[model samples]
Target: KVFGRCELAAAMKRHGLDNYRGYSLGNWVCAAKFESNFNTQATNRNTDGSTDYGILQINSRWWCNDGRTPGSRNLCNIPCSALLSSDITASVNCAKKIVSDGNGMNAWVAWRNRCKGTDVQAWIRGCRL
Candidate 1:
Protein backbone atom coordinates (compact mmCIF):
# COMPACT_ATOMS: atom_id res chain seq x y z
CA LYS A 1 0.00 0.00 0.00
CA VAL A 2 1.30 3.41 -0.97
CA PHE A 3 0.26 6.21 1.32
CA GLY A 4 -0.30 9.86 0.54
CA ARG A 5 1.96 12.23 2.47
CA CYS A 6 -0.64 13.37 4.98
CA GLU A 7 -1.97 9.87 5.35
CA LEU A 8 1.47 8.55 6.14
CA ALA A 9 2.02 11.34 8.65
CA ALA A 10 -1.13 10.54 10.57
CA ALA A 11 -0.42 6.84 10.45
CA MET A 12 3.04 7.35 11.90
CA LYS A 13 1.62 9.66 14.52
CA ARG A 14 -1.01 7.05 15.37
CA HIS A 15 1.79 4.56 15.95
CA GLY A 16 3.74 7.08 18.06
CA LEU A 17 6.47 8.19 15.74
CA ASP A 18 5.57 11.78 16.54
CA ASN A 19 8.31 13.01 18.88
CA TYR A 20 9.63 9.46 19.15
CA ARG A 21 13.28 9.26 20.08
CA GLY A 22 13.45 13.05 19.85
CA TYR A 23 12.45 13.13 16.20
CA SER A 24 9.32 14.93 15.03
CA LEU A 25 6.49 13.82 12.76
CA GLY A 26 8.10 15.85 10.04
CA ASN A 27 11.25 13.85 10.42
CA TRP A 28 9.35 10.59 10.19
CA VAL A 29 7.45 11.79 7.18
CA CYS A 30 10.64 12.89 5.52
CA ALA A 31 12.28 9.57 6.20
CA ALA A 32 9.37 7.67 4.73
CA LYS A 33 9.40 9.85 1.65
CA PHE A 34 13.00 9.16 0.72
CA GLU A 35 13.25 5.67 2.10
CA SER A 36 10.28 4.02 0.46
CA ASN A 37 8.01 6.80 -0.72
CA PHE A 38 5.51 5.63 1.90
CA ASN A 39 5.34 2.28 0.22
CA THR A 40 4.45 -0.69 2.36
CA GLN A 41 6.00 -3.30 0.08
CA ALA A 42 9.13 -1.45 -0.87
CA THR A 43 12.33 -3.50 -0.83
CA ASN A 44 15.94 -2.72 -1.55
CA ARG A 45 19.00 -4.95 -1.68
CA ASN A 46 22.15 -3.64 -0.11
CA THR A 47 25.44 -4.06 -1.87
CA ASP A 48 26.62 -6.13 1.08
CA GLY A 49 23.89 -8.66 0.25
CA SER A 50 21.41 -7.77 2.97
CA THR A 51 18.00 -6.49 1.98
CA ASP A 52 15.94 -3.58 3.29
CA TYR A 53 12.30 -4.36 3.86
CA GLY A 54 9.14 -2.30 4.01
CA ILE A 55 8.48 1.43 4.23
CA LEU A 56 11.13 2.41 6.73
CA GLN A 57 13.42 -0.03 5.00
CA ILE A 58 14.28 -2.06 8.04
CA ASN A 59 17.33 -4.16 7.37
CA SER A 60 17.79 -7.91 7.55
CA ARG A 61 21.25 -7.51 9.04
CA TRP A 62 20.17 -5.99 12.32
CA TRP A 63 16.40 -5.85 12.52
CA CYS A 64 14.32 -8.53 10.86
CA ASN A 65 15.29 -12.12 10.20
CA ASP A 66 14.96 -12.83 6.52
CA GLY A 67 16.71 -16.20 6.77
CA ARG A 68 19.02 -14.88 4.11
CA THR A 69 21.23 -12.37 5.91
CA PRO A 70 24.04 -14.25 7.55
CA GLY A 71 24.45 -13.62 11.28
CA SER A 72 21.40 -11.45 11.51
CA ARG A 73 20.64 -10.10 14.97
CA ASN A 74 16.93 -10.04 14.33
CA LEU A 75 16.52 -7.46 17.07
CA CYS A 76 12.99 -6.67 15.95
CA ASN A 77 12.11 -10.34 16.57
CA ILE A 78 10.05 -10.44 13.42
CA PRO A 79 10.34 -11.92 9.97
CA CYS A 80 11.27 -9.37 7.34
CA SER A 81 8.08 -10.38 5.59
CA ALA A 82 6.10 -8.94 8.47
CA LEU A 83 7.20 -5.43 7.60
CA LEU A 84 5.59 -5.68 4.19
CA SER A 85 2.08 -5.79 5.57
CA SER A 86 -0.08 -2.98 4.26
CA ASP A 87 -1.30 -2.25 7.79
CA ILE A 88 2.15 -0.86 8.68
CA THR A 89 1.75 -1.73 12.33
CA ALA A 90 4.79 -3.95 12.37
CA SER A 91 6.68 -1.49 10.26
CA VAL A 92 6.07 1.33 12.71
CA ASN A 93 7.06 -0.82 15.67
CA CYS A 94 10.29 -1.87 14.06
CA ALA A 95 10.98 1.71 13.16
CA LYS A 96 10.45 2.76 16.76
CA LYS A 97 12.63 -0.06 18.03
CA ILE A 98 15.36 0.80 15.61
CA VAL A 99 15.49 4.36 16.87
CA SER A 100 15.05 3.48 20.52
CA ASP A 101 17.97 1.13 20.21
CA GLY A 102 20.19 4.25 20.30
CA ASN A 103 20.42 4.51 16.53
CA GLY A 104 17.75 7.16 16.13
CA MET A 105 16.66 7.94 12.59
CA ASN A 106 20.22 7.63 11.39
CA ALA A 107 19.65 3.90 10.98
CA TRP A 108 18.10 4.87 7.67
CA VAL A 109 20.61 6.46 5.32
CA ALA A 110 17.86 7.87 3.22
CA TRP A 111 16.83 9.91 6.24
CA ARG A 112 20.37 10.96 6.87
CA ASN A 113 20.96 12.08 3.33
CA ARG A 114 17.61 13.69 2.74
CA CYS A 115 15.77 14.45 5.96
CA LYS A 116 18.69 14.89 8.32
CA GLY A 117 19.67 18.46 7.55
CA THR A 118 16.60 19.66 5.79
CA ASP A 119 13.43 21.40 6.84
CA VAL A 120 11.47 18.19 7.21
CA GLN A 121 8.24 20.12 7.60
CA ALA A 122 8.03 20.26 3.85
CA TRP A 123 7.35 16.58 3.91
CA ILE A 124 4.25 17.06 5.99
CA ARG A 125 3.19 20.52 4.95
CA GLY A 126 -0.53 21.30 5.19
CA CYS A 127 -1.19 18.00 6.94
CA ARG A 128 -3.58 18.05 9.87
CA LEU A 129 -2.56 15.70 12.63
Candidate 2:
Protein backbone atom coordinates (compact mmCIF):
# COMPACT_ATOMS: atom_id res chain seq x y z
CA LYS A 1 0.00 0.00 0.00
CA VAL A 2 1.21 3.46 -0.85
CA PHE A 3 0.96 6.10 1.87
CA GLY A 4 1.24 9.86 1.87
CA ARG A 5 4.06 11.43 3.86
CA CYS A 6 1.84 12.65 6.66
CA GLU A 7 0.00 9.38 6.78
CA LEU A 8 3.28 7.56 7.11
CA ALA A 9 4.37 9.88 9.89
CA ALA A 10 1.14 9.40 11.77
CA ALA A 11 1.50 5.65 11.49
CA MET A 12 5.09 5.77 12.62
CA LYS A 13 4.16 7.91 15.56
CA ARG A 14 1.44 5.45 16.51
CA HIS A 15 4.06 2.73 16.43
CA GLY A 16 6.28 4.73 18.80
CA LEU A 17 8.82 5.27 16.09
CA ASP A 18 8.84 9.04 16.35
CA ASN A 19 11.88 8.51 18.57
CA TYR A 20 13.01 4.95 18.49
CA ARG A 21 16.43 3.85 19.58
CA GLY A 22 17.84 7.36 19.29
CA TYR A 23 16.67 7.82 15.72
CA SER A 24 14.18 10.53 14.98
CA LEU A 25 10.92 10.16 13.12
CA GLY A 26 12.48 12.28 10.42
CA ASN A 27 15.22 9.72 10.00
CA TRP A 28 12.74 6.89 9.66
CA VAL A 29 10.60 8.90 7.29
CA CYS A 30 13.56 9.80 5.15
CA ALA A 31 14.79 6.25 5.10
CA ALA A 32 11.38 4.96 4.14
CA LYS A 33 11.11 7.52 1.37
CA PHE A 34 14.36 6.49 -0.17
CA GLU A 35 13.95 2.80 0.52
CA SER A 36 10.40 2.14 -0.56
CA ASN A 37 8.64 5.47 -0.92
CA PHE A 38 6.36 4.43 1.96
CA ASN A 39 4.88 1.62 -0.05
CA THR A 40 4.29 -1.43 2.08
CA GLN A 41 4.37 -3.77 -0.92
CA ALA A 42 7.61 -2.50 -2.34
CA THR A 43 10.24 -5.09 -3.21
CA ASN A 44 13.70 -4.81 -4.69
CA ARG A 45 16.07 -7.36 -6.13
CA ASN A 46 19.63 -7.16 -4.93
CA THR A 47 22.69 -8.05 -6.94
CA ASP A 48 23.35 -10.80 -4.43
CA GLY A 49 19.95 -12.29 -5.37
CA SER A 50 18.39 -11.59 -2.00
CA THR A 51 15.31 -9.39 -1.97
CA ASP A 52 14.44 -6.47 0.27
CA TYR A 53 10.92 -6.41 1.63
CA GLY A 54 8.39 -3.92 3.00
CA ILE A 55 8.57 -0.35 4.27
CA LEU A 56 12.00 -0.67 5.86
CA GLN A 57 13.10 -3.08 3.16
CA ILE A 58 14.16 -5.84 5.52
CA ASN A 59 16.30 -8.37 3.72
CA SER A 60 15.39 -11.94 2.95
CA ARG A 61 18.84 -13.26 3.72
CA TRP A 62 18.74 -12.63 7.42
CA TRP A 63 15.28 -11.35 8.24
CA CYS A 64 12.12 -12.64 6.59
CA ASN A 65 11.49 -15.66 4.41
CA ASP A 66 10.80 -15.08 0.72
CA GLY A 67 10.51 -18.81 0.15
CA ARG A 68 12.47 -18.71 -3.09
CA THR A 69 15.59 -17.73 -1.17
CA PRO A 70 17.55 -20.51 0.42
CA GLY A 71 19.32 -20.27 3.76
CA SER A 72 17.26 -17.39 5.03
CA ARG A 73 17.85 -17.01 8.75
CA ASN A 74 14.24 -15.91 9.19
CA LEU A 75 15.42 -14.22 12.32
CA CYS A 76 12.20 -12.22 12.45
CA ASN A 77 10.31 -15.49 12.08
CA ILE A 78 7.66 -13.93 9.90
CA PRO A 79 6.82 -14.39 6.25
CA CYS A 80 8.10 -11.72 3.91
CA SER A 81 4.52 -11.05 2.86
CA ALA A 82 3.71 -10.10 6.41
CA LEU A 83 5.81 -7.02 5.96
CA LEU A 84 3.91 -6.09 2.83
CA SER A 85 0.67 -5.38 4.59
CA SER A 86 -0.68 -1.88 4.96
CA ASP A 87 -0.81 -2.52 8.70
CA ILE A 88 2.82 -2.05 9.72
CA THR A 89 2.75 -3.32 13.26
CA ALA A 90 4.68 -6.46 12.44
CA SER A 91 7.11 -4.55 10.28
CA VAL A 92 7.82 -2.01 13.00
CA ASN A 93 8.34 -4.71 15.58
CA CYS A 94 10.85 -6.45 13.33
CA ALA A 95 12.55 -3.18 12.50
CA LYS A 96 13.05 -2.43 16.17
CA LYS A 97 14.72 -5.78 16.61
CA ILE A 98 16.94 -5.14 13.62
CA VAL A 99 18.03 -1.78 14.97
CA SER A 100 18.62 -3.19 18.44
CA ASP A 101 20.81 -5.89 16.94
CA GLY A 102 23.52 -3.21 16.46
CA ASN A 103 23.04 -2.26 12.80
CA GLY A 104 20.84 0.65 13.82
CA MET A 105 19.47 2.27 10.66
CA ASN A 106 22.66 1.25 8.91
CA ALA A 107 20.90 -2.01 8.20
CA TRP A 108 19.26 0.02 5.45
CA VAL A 109 21.66 1.35 2.86
CA ALA A 110 19.16 4.09 2.04
CA TRP A 111 19.36 5.40 5.60
CA ARG A 112 23.16 5.49 5.58
CA ASN A 113 23.52 6.94 2.11
CA ARG A 114 20.64 9.40 2.13
CA CYS A 115 19.51 10.16 5.66
CA LYS A 116 22.70 9.93 7.70
CA GLY A 117 24.02 13.29 8.89
CA THR A 118 21.30 15.07 6.98
CA ASP A 119 18.63 17.28 8.44
CA VAL A 120 15.54 15.31 7.65
CA GLN A 121 13.15 17.55 9.52
CA ALA A 122 11.49 18.41 6.23
CA TRP A 123 10.20 14.90 6.17
CA ILE A 124 7.88 15.73 9.02
CA ARG A 125 7.41 19.43 8.44
CA GLY A 126 3.61 19.32 8.13
CA CYS A 127 2.79 16.15 9.96
CA ARG A 128 1.61 17.89 13.12
CA LEU A 129 2.83 14.99 15.16
Query: Which number leads on TM-score?
Result: 1
Off by over 4 Å in 1: none
**Model 2, residue 88: displacement in angstroms?**
1.5
Per-candidate clashes come to 0, 0
Using alpha carbons, what is the TM-score of model 2?
0.93
What lDDT tens digits, residue by residue, belong to model 1 across residues 1-129? 998889999998899888998899999988988999999899998887689999889999999999999779999999999999997889889998898788979899999999999999887889977
For each candidate in turn, the TM-score is 0.96, 0.93
Which regions of candidate 2 deviate over 4 angstroms? none
Compose the digit string of candidate 2's lDDT tens values, residues 22-100.
8899888888888899999899978786889998898888888888677788888888888888988777877887887
